[PDB]
Design a protein around this nucleic acid. Sequence first.
DNA 1: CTACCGATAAGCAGACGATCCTCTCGA
DNA 2: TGCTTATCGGTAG
RNA 3: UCGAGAGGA
Lengths: 56, 135, 150, 114, 49, 98, 56, 56, 92, 83
Amino acid sequence: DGPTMREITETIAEAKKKVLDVTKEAQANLLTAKHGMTLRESFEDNVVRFLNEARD
Amino acid sequence: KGRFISTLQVKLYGRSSARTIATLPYIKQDIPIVIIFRALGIIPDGEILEHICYDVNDWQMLEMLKPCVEDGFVIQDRETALDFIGRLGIRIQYAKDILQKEFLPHITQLEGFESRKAFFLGYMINRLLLCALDR
Amino acid sequence: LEPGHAADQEQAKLIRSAIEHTTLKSVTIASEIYYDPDPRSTVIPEDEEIIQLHFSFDQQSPWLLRLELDRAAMNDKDLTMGQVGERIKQTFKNDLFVIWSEDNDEKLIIRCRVVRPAEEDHMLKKIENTMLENITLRGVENIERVVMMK
Amino acid sequence: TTFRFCRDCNNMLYPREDKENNRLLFECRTCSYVEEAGSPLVYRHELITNIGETAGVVQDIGSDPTLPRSDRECPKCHSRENVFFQSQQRRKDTSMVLFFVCLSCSHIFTSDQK
Amino acid sequence: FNMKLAINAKTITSGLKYALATGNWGEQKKAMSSRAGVSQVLNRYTYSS
Amino acid sequence: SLMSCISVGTDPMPIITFLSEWGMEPLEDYVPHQSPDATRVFVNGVWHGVHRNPARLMETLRTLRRKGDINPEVSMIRDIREKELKIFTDAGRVYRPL
Amino acid sequence: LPHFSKDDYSPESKGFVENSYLRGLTPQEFFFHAMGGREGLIDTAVKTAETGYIQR
Amino acid sequence: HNGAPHHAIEEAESLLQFHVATYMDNDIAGQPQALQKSGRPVKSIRARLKGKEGRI
Amino acid sequence: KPMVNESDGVTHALYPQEARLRNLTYSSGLFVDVKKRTYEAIDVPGRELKYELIDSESGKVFIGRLPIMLRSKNCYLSEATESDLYKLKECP
Amino acid sequence: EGLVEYIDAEEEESILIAMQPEDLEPAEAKRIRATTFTHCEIHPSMILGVAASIIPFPDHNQSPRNTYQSAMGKQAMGVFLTN
DNA sequence: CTACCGATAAGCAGACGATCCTCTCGA
DNA sequence: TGCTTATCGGTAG
RNA sequence: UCGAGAGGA
């Protein structure tokens, strides 16, 4: 459907900003730094979560 | 093309603090790099280190380079730097012939090009330490 | 967990730290070797207040081993300067003299000297790697990344 | 932290201790050469490193178009025309903190907040 | 020269014939540099194929 | 691929002459301390010389191929982050037009 | 890809397909998709050999 | 039977020891190989009833 | 240019369709200009040193035949156009 | 004339290519969407091979479906030559 | 203090790797 | 994924 | 017949 296509477009648009804010967070050193795993390992994990969050 | 599957696997030993550092054809033994530079006519340790450490400001390379000097400190002059067997018969001449032809086939394989061959070897050890420091 | 504790957050945190395998290699920023002969007079201006405090075995060594420590690494994995100081002391005691900075201090360092009544420099380097890649600190060996689960 | 070498024979120096005067003196093995210590420090390990995070920055940095460009301003020159790159220390643990280098001022500034 | 060259031309023409028909960039000895995916016969089912 | 083509191999000697005519220090008599930002110049993964300012060097060399003096098959890279310049006239390289 | 800038940690530059199959994949998406496909058949051809050995 | 040359018999006996062994196993050891010119080896009894498409 | 000589006959002008049909190798002849020189030294053991210093064969001596590639620089097909390619029994 | 250039896989490391010469040029429904581009891409369809170019709308299909087709297209009838 | 009893490392090759089916091309 | 074979250092005779 | 390659669900 017409509005559904636009609704799917905005789902990926908010997700991009969701990833952008996490990307900006990692650039300023301040990050969650989850136990055991690396800071970069922690980033990818939270990034791919947002990517599939919008997808499904 | 000349085929020749000639390869010089320059190997860095030790993972605590035994940072010794290369294979040469046709020799069934690993040769410390300091002896290789002395056999090329470069006897002073400072000049040898100038081939590896281009930036004499950074200390990190020299620290890893510190033990690979004392390991072959017995060998000093070119006369004693070439005598290392390689094979037994009589040999200094056998290893002398290896350096001109077999060792570093690219660039040139004539004779009087010791400075050109040592700089390639100097860069190879440099690249090996660059990944050892994780740079 | 202990059957007595059904679902205790702080009890689980007590276990994970008591089992996780850790060493000096995981906390030390840099391992330095300095030259200082007088035991009551150190070259380092930071290592001054610490000296007079510790003074209150037989024949000392003029070879000092300084070890810079990360304030965050000791904080994130639960460690103190007192517990580390005695962990190195228990592995030697009569063999080596161990000095350590106060936990309150801005700079966290460990001062180590030999006690054997000089060719010690090259011998000290072998002792350095044993302190970082051999001496255990917390939990049982082979153990790695530990995680709590809901 | 820097190391010195004999003037006569350009060979490696070994530190020797004056057991009488109580002071460090770097000696030679090839020859009998000696010299007084410039610094009490002998050997440094440095496990945790901050070095080489801003490595390989020739002033011909503007020539490389592969690098992404920023609209940020310098603290002293206030230059808008800037270029940047991630941590040059290629390690498993290292963070994704940006390093801004300016084309016309040669000054380098971080994006770090900790 | 030329009389010996007649037998030598045969070893050179057959040396090129052997490799280009079988597929092995080595001597007629066999098992030495036995790379068979060299002299592959041309496909002719479709023009695009 | 449709566009892709393989290299046949051109003689490296003509290019070696042009490189020497624009600034090239011999490897037999090289200065490490004297030269600060030493741009290590490589021909087919083989060290030959060193040049001080490669900015104008690359600028002159890039148009030399475009003119037709140097075969466009031959590749040339400038790594500013490692102070290096590799030039390849080797046989077997895959190249696409842009 | 040479089409992307250095140290670009965006989802679009790391294999994320925003376009629908109906919409049509862009060349950037299509190559990363081809990588995700090529790896798939490799996981088939290899794991199938070990299975025949496992059953016997 | 004839004029036994001592260290000339062993040079032939070793050939018989080789011929009898290559007949049963031509796979075979660390350094010997044995072939039936033109350049292709002989099919031994071990290799005739060997695993996967071979008697058993 | 690819030409293969037959039994009791002249060197036949071998064409791509001819080799494909007659089941023959599309090979081109090679000839080198060899220089035979001797090159003597009237000497006895010590001394010794230098020579100071001392055959035109047939018109370019044969060495063998190289299989020539179709549409290559040394092939008939490189010069040929569509109009004449049909008379050669070759597909354009 | 110096209008087009042949870039090797090694040479691709030091350059930036602009895919769309229209979109990636000024500032600024169909499919979804620093300015220092050294080179320009001829046409995106040029990344495909032989049999791949014969596939209609390969972007709209799944990659293994085109990978299955890639080798399947080799086993076709038609006319290969006129001779 | 020496002879013996077992400890861990040095040195160090082995033979296996889907099931069936189609077809050509030599030497 | 095994095996093979020296070297080692240690208790008690 | 042996050996090599190509292709199939």
